[PDB]
Amino acid sequence: PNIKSAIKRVKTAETRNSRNASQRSAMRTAIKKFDEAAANNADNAKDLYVEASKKLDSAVSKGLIHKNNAARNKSRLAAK
Amino acid sequence: RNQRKVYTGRVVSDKMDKTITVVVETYKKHGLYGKRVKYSKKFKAHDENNIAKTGDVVRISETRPLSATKHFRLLEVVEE
Amino acid sequence: PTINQLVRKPRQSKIKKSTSPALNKGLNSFKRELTDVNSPQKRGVCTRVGTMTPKKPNSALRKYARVRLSNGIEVTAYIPGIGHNLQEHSVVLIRGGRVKDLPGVRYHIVRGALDTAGVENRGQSRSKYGTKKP
Amino acid sequence: AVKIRLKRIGSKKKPFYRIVVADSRFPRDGRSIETIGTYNPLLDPVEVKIDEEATLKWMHNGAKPSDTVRNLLSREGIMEKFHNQKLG
RNA sequence: GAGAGUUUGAUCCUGGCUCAGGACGAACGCUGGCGGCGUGCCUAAUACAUGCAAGUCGAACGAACGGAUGUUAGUGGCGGACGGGUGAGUAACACGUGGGCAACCUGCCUGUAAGUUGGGGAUAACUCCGGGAAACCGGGGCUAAUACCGAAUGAUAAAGUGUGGCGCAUGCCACGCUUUUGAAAGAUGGUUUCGGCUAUCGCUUACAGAUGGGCCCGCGGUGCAUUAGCUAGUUGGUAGGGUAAUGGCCUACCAAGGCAACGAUGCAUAGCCGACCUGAGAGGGUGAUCGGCCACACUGGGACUGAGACACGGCCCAGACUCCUACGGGAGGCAGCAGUAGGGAAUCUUCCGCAAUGGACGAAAGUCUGACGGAGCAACGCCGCGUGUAUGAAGAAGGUUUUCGGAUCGUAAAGUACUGUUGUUAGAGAAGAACAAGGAUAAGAGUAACUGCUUGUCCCUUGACGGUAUCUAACCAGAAAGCCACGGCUAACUACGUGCCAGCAGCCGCGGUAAUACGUAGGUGGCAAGCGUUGUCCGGAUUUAUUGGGCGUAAAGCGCGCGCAGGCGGUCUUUUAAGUCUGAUGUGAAAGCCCCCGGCUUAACCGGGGAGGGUCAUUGGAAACUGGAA
Ligand SMILES: [K+]
Ligand SMILES: [Mg+2]
Ligand SMILES: [Mg+2]
Ligand SMILES: [Mg+2]
Ligand SMILES: [Mg+2]
Ligand SMILES: [Mg+2]
Ligand SMILES: [Mg+2]
Ligand SMILES: [Mg+2]
Ligand SMILES: [Mg+2]
């Protein structure tokens, strides 16, 4: 850039990207653990639902996801 | 409640799955030379059970979008 | 006609022709494509200069110049007034106006705008023919 | 934000002002939500016209004034009024 | 609702061509005094020399500077998505108007209800090392938070549910039980006793609202058929995932639909509207300036960040183009304001200030703002004012002309009297300014009370324009008029010179030795700080005729039929309400046209108020006519 503040927001945005990407990937590995375990119809899936819902609502509170998305994902998972 | 749009017309085809197409046929005034013109306009009606048939008089009403084209719904079958 | 006829086809007016087609066309070297723009006057470069025999009833010699305008169109322009400064490769400014005596001329040269030096010795209508006040 | 402010109108070296409801974002003389009064600083008593019931309403909805619009309201007795309606 | 000229020997019709009006973002020619209001790259969305256009917070944080205030380069927060530009693309839910979302979001603003509990780990800055001219890059070590990450307690978030009241199928609203999740932070300030308490600015959860957006829909607005077929996730369905949210949005499987002569598809063109110009009106053309919406920021694509972007002055990558280099390697996008080149018939100052209005940040002081206020230039336009006023003759000098007597320029001049709008000189010198902050205090809600908060009244305060407008005096007619035409159309005629030559001309047409038509002089007419020409738009043009034309001979009846589609359809009864007609409600923004008031020395201009405008929509009525039905 060429303005004093643009470079600042590039820094800030790369930082936030790293953070929120990590958090999303963790959320989605959780959700995939759940859906694979639920496809296999195992014992662990009822705790994995909870892990996924924890990470969904935590992501909501962190801002990286919207609450209707979190709600919908809890609904669809609960439907398994 | 606020109220939705309702129309009446005639059925032209049945090939589609759980739906029909309702053709509305109104006279209206040509903008410049004043004559009445047969204006026609077909819509896709949401037929929950493949009830109606070709040659059927029918009433429809609008709703949320249901396909690429549909925005309406079957309300009554006024006259076979 | 019937009203149904008039609805099946509405009316269609006449296609107007301009007195001055070449003033109503611009050019851009980039696209190399003419661009319709209404213009009052254009400047050009005199290809040729000469005299004409006009129509019946008349017989006097009429001064013209074949010009290449800014937009590339080649045009015959009457040189009104007594005497002129112009010759080959002379730059000229051009307004519209039809010489009724002369077949192939449709435009005039504005006298006094550019290398078209004003008329000599004129005292009346000086704003035409482009003489200053003395 | 939603703000109550002045819309500049009139001509050069002779301003006039409409008292307007608008977003912070919109332009100075751009669009508005509702205009509810007028203002003129030229005259020995500055000439204000305000509806005051819609104005109380926009304040209850949270449309805040500017500085000069606030003090026009206060010299019209509307900010006391609005405080009086905030008392309950 | 005005017409005139032009075809003929003449006439009537037909038919074209031109003209008399109005308007321009105008240009050009001649000329040129001023004031007010406005407008000013329409062309090359061509390229950019330079400068300034987005910063702010020290009451978030740590370091450094400093003789406690203050300053900073950094981390962090908010804003950068507004404001500003242009109209490239775009023939479509892009725009207008009117609805729908039971299918959707929304930081900052307001209010209501709860809560800011305890801990952890790093990371810049910094210091070193190496690189590199230097910036700036890496690697190691140290460090703070309103930066980050955990937990407990809390969901009107999910899941299991049951009751009440309901809608428009999908469904909605309210209530309650069970289970599972989801939060935070401090800073300043006072007081107290030291524990505490506590105002404000912040933070977190939920609810409402307002504001801002999103999706869908009816209808409406462009030419071409010397463009008739188009489509293949294309159309529907069952499952699934995805978005803030519905949906082929996407995926898999099934069927083979769907659109289209009511003009699909394709080509070229164009931002759309309010509105502007014209017109008796219907309509015609335009989409400058002003406002709204849309789209796009060298071209293309893509995401991150964030409430909000797929971002004018952000990122990445590809492409074009350019600049600096120490030649190792770096940087950039004026359609931001000025400005430069180029193009073009053509369009502004590389100006002042944030005093005002408005926005960003901040507790605020304040800072930032080429938004905006203003000033500059251009007779580009609209309005206004002048460039003297009076008096003054059978009538000067001079010019033109002379029927040589006169006639005219002409009361014009001269001469006399007078004035100072303007000019100049010297003096005075408003509005616009509100405030904010701060200092006082009077009342409140809330406090253990203080601090603080809200409100009332005073004080104080800061002007770029600008010593600009405005006003007073003094002096001077003194320094301030030009352009076009004069055969008809159409206002206004003579003389000379020329001799179908030179030249004129919007149409008809002038000029070949006696030219009101050419050139010049005088005089006249029309206008006047402008006049004229050119270019474009409407009208006149009933010359695309819905209003409002026609086809024997003038242009115009397919050479004639058979006939799909469409258009149109005998008489009567019942039925409806598709069209029609009608009452109510809602809206059609402001500005602009129109009417009524007011203010600028009037005017232009500006303000206030009203009215109008829709083949607008919903709801409720009539059945005469068209249409549907028996
Ligand atoms: K599709
Ligand atoms: Mg275009
Ligand atoms: Mg007419
Ligand atoms: Mg940006
Ligand atoms: Mg830029
Ligand atoms: Mg520029
Ligand atoms: Mg003669
Ligand atoms: Mg004939
Ligand atoms: Mg209006």
mmCIF file with all atom_site columns, N, CA and C (backbone and C1' of nucleotides) in Angstrom, chain E residues 457-475:
data_model
loop_
_atom_site.group_PDB
_atom_site.id
_atom_site.type_symbol
_atom_site.label_atom_id
_atom_site.label_alt_id
_atom_site.label_comp_id
_atom_site.label_asym_id
_atom_site.label_entity_id
_atom_site.label_seq_id
_atom_site.pdbx_PDB_ins_code
_atom_site.Cartn_x
_atom_site.Cartn_y
_atom_site.Cartn_z
_atom_site.occupancy
_atom_site.B_iso_or_equiv
_atom_site.pdbx_formal_charge
_atom_site.auth_seq_id
_atom_site.auth_comp_id
_atom_site.auth_asym_id
_atom_site.auth_atom_id
_atom_site.pdbx_PDB_model_num
ATOM 1   P P     . U E 1 457 ? -32.787 27.837 29.245 1.00 0.00 ? 457 U E P     1
ATOM 2   O "O5'" . U E 1 457 ? -32.176 28.951 30.204 1.00 0.00 ? 457 U E "O5'" 1
ATOM 3   C "C5'" . U E 1 457 ? -33.020 29.749 31.020 1.00 0.00 ? 457 U E "C5'" 1
ATOM 4   C "C4'" . U E 1 457 ? -32.231 30.544 32.027 1.00 0.00 ? 457 U E "C4'" 1
ATOM 5   C "C3'" . U E 1 457 ? -31.118 31.389 31.441 1.00 0.00 ? 457 U E "C3'" 1
ATOM 6   O "O3'" . U E 1 457 ? -31.618 32.634 30.994 1.00 0.00 ? 457 U E "O3'" 1
ATOM 7   C "C1'" . U E 1 457 ? -30.333 30.199 33.357 1.00 0.00 ? 457 U E "C1'" 1
ATOM 8   P P     . C E 1 458 ? -30.784 33.537 29.969 1.00 0.00 ? 458 C E P     1
ATOM 9   O "O5'" . C E 1 458 ? -29.719 34.252 30.905 1.00 0.00 ? 458 C E "O5'" 1
ATOM 10  C "C5'" . C E 1 458 ? -28.365 34.329 30.515 1.00 0.00 ? 458 C E "C5'" 1
ATOM 11  C "C4'" . C E 1 458 ? -27.475 34.698 31.669 1.00 0.00 ? 458 C E "C4'" 1
ATOM 12  C "C3'" . C E 1 458 ? -26.038 35.000 31.279 1.00 0.00 ? 458 C E "C3'" 1
ATOM 13  O "O3'" . C E 1 458 ? -25.871 36.353 30.899 1.00 0.00 ? 458 C E "O3'" 1
ATOM 14  C "C1'" . C E 1 458 ? -26.055 33.409 33.022 1.00 0.00 ? 458 C E "C1'" 1
ATOM 15  P P     . C E 1 459 ? -25.001 36.737 29.607 1.00 0.00 ? 459 C E P     1
ATOM 16  O "O5'" . C E 1 459 ? -23.509 36.473 30.081 1.00 0.00 ? 459 C E "O5'" 1
ATOM 17  C "C5'" . C E 1 459 ? -23.031 37.029 31.296 1.00 0.00 ? 459 C E "C5'" 1
ATOM 18  C "C4'" . C E 1 459 ? -21.664 36.507 31.640 1.00 0.00 ? 459 C E "C4'" 1
ATOM 19  C "C3'" . C E 1 459 ? -20.677 36.412 30.492 1.00 0.00 ? 459 C E "C3'" 1
ATOM 20  O "O3'" . C E 1 459 ? -20.056 37.653 30.223 1.00 0.00 ? 459 C E "O3'" 1
ATOM 21  C "C1'" . C E 1 459 ? -20.607 34.428 31.795 1.00 0.00 ? 459 C E "C1'" 1
ATOM 22  P P     . C E 1 460 ? -19.675 38.058 28.722 1.00 0.00 ? 460 C E P     1
ATOM 23  O "O5'" . C E 1 460 ? -18.535 37.017 28.333 1.00 0.00 ? 460 C E "O5'" 1
ATOM 24  C "C5'" . C E 1 460 ? -17.314 36.971 29.056 1.00 0.00 ? 460 C E "C5'" 1
ATOM 25  C "C4'" . C E 1 460 ? -16.489 35.763 28.688 1.00 0.00 ? 460 C E "C4'" 1
ATOM 26  C "C3'" . C E 1 460 ? -16.304 35.521 27.206 1.00 0.00 ? 460 C E "C3'" 1
ATOM 27  O "O3'" . C E 1 460 ? -15.305 36.352 26.650 1.00 0.00 ? 460 C E "O3'" 1
ATOM 28  C "C1'" . C E 1 460 ? -16.830 33.488 28.286 1.00 0.00 ? 460 C E "C1'" 1
ATOM 29  P P     . U E 1 461 ? -15.582 37.178 25.301 1.00 0.00 ? 461 U E P     1
ATOM 30  O "O5'" . U E 1 461 ? -15.179 36.150 24.157 1.00 0.00 ? 461 U E "O5'" 1
ATOM 31  C "C5'" . U E 1 461 ? -13.889 35.561 24.151 1.00 0.00 ? 461 U E "C5'" 1
ATOM 32  C "C4'" . U E 1 461 ? -13.912 34.145 23.644 1.00 0.00 ? 461 U E "C4'" 1
ATOM 33  C "C3'" . U E 1 461 ? -14.480 33.926 22.254 1.00 0.00 ? 461 U E "C3'" 1
ATOM 34  O "O3'" . U E 1 461 ? -13.655 34.355 21.181 1.00 0.00 ? 461 U E "O3'" 1
ATOM 35  C "C1'" . U E 1 461 ? -15.340 32.288 23.704 1.00 0.00 ? 461 U E "C1'" 1
ATOM 36  P P     . U E 1 462 ? -12.094 33.989 21.091 1.00 0.00 ? 462 U E P     1
ATOM 37  O "O5'" . U E 1 462 ? -11.743 34.305 19.571 1.00 0.00 ? 462 U E "O5'" 1
ATOM 38  C "C5'" . U E 1 462 ? -10.984 33.401 18.789 1.00 0.00 ? 462 U E "C5'" 1
ATOM 39  C "C4'" . U E 1 462 ? -11.850 32.609 17.839 1.00 0.00 ? 462 U E "C4'" 1
ATOM 40  C "C3'" . U E 1 462 ? -12.592 33.373 16.764 1.00 0.00 ? 462 U E "C3'" 1
ATOM 41  O "O3'" . U E 1 462 ? -11.766 33.820 15.706 1.00 0.00 ? 462 U E "O3'" 1
ATOM 42  C "C1'" . U E 1 462 ? -13.973 31.671 17.647 1.00 0.00 ? 462 U E "C1'" 1
ATOM 43  P P     . G E 1 463 ? -12.336 34.876 14.641 1.00 0.00 ? 463 G E P     1
ATOM 44  O "O5'" . G E 1 463 ? -13.273 34.011 13.689 1.00 0.00 ? 463 G E "O5'" 1
ATOM 45  C "C5'" . G E 1 463 ? -12.731 32.980 12.876 1.00 0.00 ? 463 G E "C5'" 1
ATOM 46  C "C4'" . G E 1 463 ? -12.982 33.223 11.410 1.00 0.00 ? 463 G E "C4'" 1
ATOM 47  C "C3'" . G E 1 463 ? -12.350 34.490 10.846 1.00 0.00 ? 463 G E "C3'" 1
ATOM 48  O "O3'" . G E 1 463 ? -11.826 34.271 9.541  1.00 0.00 ? 463 G E "O3'" 1
ATOM 49  C "C1'" . G E 1 463 ? -14.713 34.572 10.580 1.00 0.00 ? 463 G E "C1'" 1
ATOM 50  P P     . A E 1 464 ? -10.388 34.888 9.183  1.00 0.00 ? 464 A E P     1
ATOM 51  O "O5'" . A E 1 464 ? -10.181 34.546 7.647  1.00 0.00 ? 464 A E "O5'" 1
ATOM 52  C "C5'" . A E 1 464 ? -9.228  33.586 7.222  1.00 0.00 ? 464 A E "C5'" 1
ATOM 53  C "C4'" . A E 1 464 ? -9.687  32.899 5.962  1.00 0.00 ? 464 A E "C4'" 1
ATOM 54  C "C3'" . A E 1 464 ? -10.292 33.793 4.892  1.00 0.00 ? 464 A E "C3'" 1
ATOM 55  O "O3'" . A E 1 464 ? -9.309  34.399 4.076  1.00 0.00 ? 464 A E "O3'" 1
ATOM 56  C "C1'" . A E 1 464 ? -11.645 31.879 5.213  1.00 0.00 ? 464 A E "C1'" 1
ATOM 57  P P     . C E 1 465 ? -9.586  35.815 3.383  1.00 0.00 ? 465 C E P     1
ATOM 58  O "O5'" . C E 1 465 ? -11.074 35.705 2.827  1.00 0.00 ? 465 C E "O5'" 1
ATOM 59  C "C5'" . C E 1 465 ? -11.338 35.198 1.528  1.00 0.00 ? 465 C E "C5'" 1
ATOM 60  C "C4'" . C E 1 465 ? -12.816 35.117 1.238  1.00 0.00 ? 465 C E "C4'" 1
ATOM 61  C "C3'" . C E 1 465 ? -13.540 36.441 1.102  1.00 0.00 ? 465 C E "C3'" 1
ATOM 62  O "O3'" . C E 1 465 ? -13.395 36.987 -0.197 1.00 0.00 ? 465 C E "O3'" 1
ATOM 63  C "C1'" . C E 1 465 ? -14.780 34.997 2.509  1.00 0.00 ? 465 C E "C1'" 1
ATOM 64  P P     . G E 1 466 ? -13.130 38.553 -0.456 1.00 0.00 ? 466 G E P     1
ATOM 65  O "O5'" . G E 1 466 ? -12.616 39.142 0.924  1.00 0.00 ? 466 G E "O5'" 1
ATOM 66  C "C5'" . G E 1 466 ? -11.649 40.179 0.934  1.00 0.00 ? 466 G E "C5'" 1
ATOM 67  C "C4'" . G E 1 466 ? -11.470 40.771 2.310  1.00 0.00 ? 466 G E "C4'" 1
ATOM 68  C "C3'" . G E 1 466 ? -10.716 39.896 3.299  1.00 0.00 ? 466 G E "C3'" 1
ATOM 69  O "O3'" . G E 1 466 ? -9.979  40.721 4.198  1.00 0.00 ? 466 G E "O3'" 1
ATOM 70  C "C1'" . G E 1 466 ? -12.892 40.288 4.111  1.00 0.00 ? 466 G E "C1'" 1
ATOM 71  P P     . G E 1 467 ? -8.504  41.233 3.815  1.00 0.00 ? 467 G E P     1
ATOM 72  O "O5'" . G E 1 467 ? -8.691  42.792 3.553  1.00 0.00 ? 467 G E "O5'" 1
ATOM 73  C "C5'" . G E 1 467 ? -9.200  43.645 4.574  1.00 0.00 ? 467 G E "C5'" 1
ATOM 74  C "C4'" . G E 1 467 ? -10.648 43.995 4.339  1.00 0.00 ? 467 G E "C4'" 1
ATOM 75  C "C3'" . G E 1 467 ? -10.885 45.196 3.425  1.00 0.00 ? 467 G E "C3'" 1
ATOM 76  O "O3'" . G E 1 467 ? -12.031 44.973 2.600  1.00 0.00 ? 467 G E "O3'" 1
ATOM 77  C "C1'" . G E 1 467 ? -11.885 45.587 5.529  1.00 0.00 ? 467 G E "C1'" 1
ATOM 78  P P     . U E 1 468 ? -11.849 44.736 1.019  1.00 0.00 ? 468 U E P     1
ATOM 79  O "O5'" . U E 1 468 ? -13.247 44.140 0.550  1.00 0.00 ? 468 U E "O5'" 1
ATOM 80  C "C5'" . U E 1 468 ? -13.368 43.467 -0.693 1.00 0.00 ? 468 U E "C5'" 1
ATOM 81  C "C4'" . U E 1 468 ? -14.671 42.721 -0.801 1.00 0.00 ? 468 U E "C4'" 1
ATOM 82  C "C3'" . U E 1 468 ? -15.918 43.582 -0.828 1.00 0.00 ? 468 U E "C3'" 1
ATOM 83  O "O3'" . U E 1 468 ? -16.177 44.159 -2.093 1.00 0.00 ? 468 U E "O3'" 1
ATOM 84  C "C1'" . U E 1 468 ? -16.234 41.827 0.697  1.00 0.00 ? 468 U E "C1'" 1
ATOM 85  P P     . A E 1 469 ? -16.980 45.544 -2.192 1.00 0.00 ? 469 A E P     1
ATOM 86  O "O5'" . A E 1 469 ? -18.438 45.176 -1.672 1.00 0.00 ? 469 A E "O5'" 1
ATOM 87  C "C5'" . A E 1 469 ? -19.352 44.511 -2.526 1.00 0.00 ? 469 A E "C5'" 1
ATOM 88  C "C4'" . A E 1 469 ? -20.511 43.920 -1.764 1.00 0.00 ? 469 A E "C4'" 1
ATOM 89  C "C3'" . A E 1 469 ? -21.600 44.892 -1.352 1.00 0.00 ? 469 A E "C3'" 1
ATOM 90  O "O3'" . A E 1 469 ? -22.507 45.176 -2.401 1.00 0.00 ? 469 A E "O3'" 1
ATOM 91  C "C1'" . A E 1 469 ? -21.015 43.553 0.498  1.00 0.00 ? 469 A E "C1'" 1
ATOM 92  P P     . U E 1 470 ? -22.831 46.697 -2.789 1.00 0.00 ? 470 U E P     1
ATOM 93  O "O5'" . U E 1 470 ? -23.358 47.321 -1.424 1.00 0.00 ? 470 U E "O5'" 1
ATOM 94  C "C5'" . U E 1 470 ? -24.532 46.807 -0.820 1.00 0.00 ? 470 U E "C5'" 1
ATOM 95  C "C4'" . U E 1 470 ? -24.761 47.375 0.551  1.00 0.00 ? 470 U E "C4'" 1
ATOM 96  C "C3'" . U E 1 470 ? -24.674 48.884 0.669  1.00 0.00 ? 470 U E "C3'" 1
ATOM 97  O "O3'" . U E 1 470 ? -25.873 49.530 0.283  1.00 0.00 ? 470 U E "O3'" 1
ATOM 98  C "C1'" . U E 1 470 ? -23.363 47.909 2.350  1.00 0.00 ? 470 U E "C1'" 1
ATOM 99  P P     . C E 1 471 ? -25.828 50.924 -0.509 1.00 0.00 ? 471 C E P     1
ATOM 100 O "O5'" . C E 1 471 ? -25.432 51.989 0.605  1.00 0.00 ? 471 C E "O5'" 1
ATOM 101 C "C5'" . C E 1 471 ? -26.205 52.114 1.788  1.00 0.00 ? 471 C E "C5'" 1
ATOM 102 C "C4'" . C E 1 471 ? -25.483 52.909 2.843  1.00 0.00 ? 471 C E "C4'" 1
ATOM 103 C "C3'" . C E 1 471 ? -24.940 54.255 2.411  1.00 0.00 ? 471 C E "C3'" 1
ATOM 104 O "O3'" . C E 1 471 ? -25.924 55.267 2.323  1.00 0.00 ? 471 C E "O3'" 1
ATOM 105 C "C1'" . C E 1 471 ? -23.288 53.124 3.626  1.00 0.00 ? 471 C E "C1'" 1
ATOM 106 P P     . U E 1 472 ? -25.667 56.532 1.373  1.00 0.00 ? 472 U E P     1
ATOM 107 O "O5'" . U E 1 472 ? -24.483 57.312 2.088  1.00 0.00 ? 472 U E "O5'" 1
ATOM 108 C "C5'" . U E 1 472 ? -24.711 57.945 3.331  1.00 0.00 ? 472 U E "C5'" 1
ATOM 109 C "C4'" . U E 1 472 ? -23.594 58.880 3.716  1.00 0.00 ? 472 U E "C4'" 1
ATOM 110 C "C3'" . U E 1 472 ? -23.062 59.792 2.627  1.00 0.00 ? 472 U E "C3'" 1
ATOM 111 O "O3'" . U E 1 472 ? -23.901 60.895 2.332  1.00 0.00 ? 472 U E "O3'" 1
ATOM 112 C "C1'" . U E 1 472 ? -21.253 58.842 3.761  1.00 0.00 ? 472 U E "C1'" 1
ATOM 113 P P     . A E 1 473 ? -23.912 61.514 0.849  1.00 0.00 ? 473 A E P     1
ATOM 114 O "O5'" . A E 1 473 ? -22.569 62.367 0.777  1.00 0.00 ? 473 A E "O5'" 1
ATOM 115 C "C5'" . A E 1 473 ? -22.347 63.444 1.672  1.00 0.00 ? 473 A E "C5'" 1
ATOM 116 C "C4'" . A E 1 473 ? -20.898 63.845 1.708  1.00 0.00 ? 473 A E "C4'" 1
ATOM 117 C "C3'" . A E 1 473 ? -20.327 64.393 0.413  1.00 0.00 ? 473 A E "C3'" 1
ATOM 118 O "O3'" . A E 1 473 ? -20.626 65.763 0.222  1.00 0.00 ? 473 A E "O3'" 1
ATOM 119 C "C1'" . A E 1 473 ? -18.857 62.772 1.297  1.00 0.00 ? 473 A E "C1'" 1
ATOM 120 P P     . A E 1 474 ? -20.841 66.358 -1.254 1.00 0.00 ? 474 A E P     1
ATOM 121 O "O5'" . A E 1 474 ? -19.375 66.406 -1.865 1.00 0.00 ? 474 A E "O5'" 1
ATOM 122 C "C5'" . A E 1 474 ? -18.336 67.142 -1.235 1.00 0.00 ? 474 A E "C5'" 1
ATOM 123 C "C4'" . A E 1 474 ? -17.013 66.885 -1.905 1.00 0.00 ? 474 A E "C4'" 1
ATOM 124 C "C3'" . A E 1 474 ? -17.000 67.014 -3.419 1.00 0.00 ? 474 A E "C3'" 1
ATOM 125 O "O3'" . A E 1 474 ? -16.889 68.357 -3.847 1.00 0.00 ? 474 A E "O3'" 1
ATOM 126 C "C1'" . A E 1 474 ? -15.889 65.028 -2.781 1.00 0.00 ? 474 A E "C1'" 1
ATOM 127 P P     . C E 1 475 ? -17.561 68.816 -5.228 1.00 0.00 ? 475 C E P     1
ATOM 128 O "O5'" . C E 1 475 ? -16.711 68.038 -6.327 1.00 0.00 ? 475 C E "O5'" 1
ATOM 129 C "C5'" . C E 1 475 ? -15.321 68.286 -6.468 1.00 0.00 ? 475 C E "C5'" 1
ATOM 130 C "C4'" . C E 1 475 ? -14.719 67.529 -7.623 1.00 0.00 ? 475 C E "C4'" 1
ATOM 131 C "C3'" . C E 1 475 ? -15.569 67.458 -8.873 1.00 0.00 ? 475 C E "C3'" 1
ATOM 132 O "O3'" . C E 1 475 ? -15.508 68.652 -9.628 1.00 0.00 ? 475 C E "O3'" 1
ATOM 133 C "C1'" . C E 1 475 ? -14.643 65.329 -8.412 1.00 0.00 ? 475 C E "C1'" 1
#
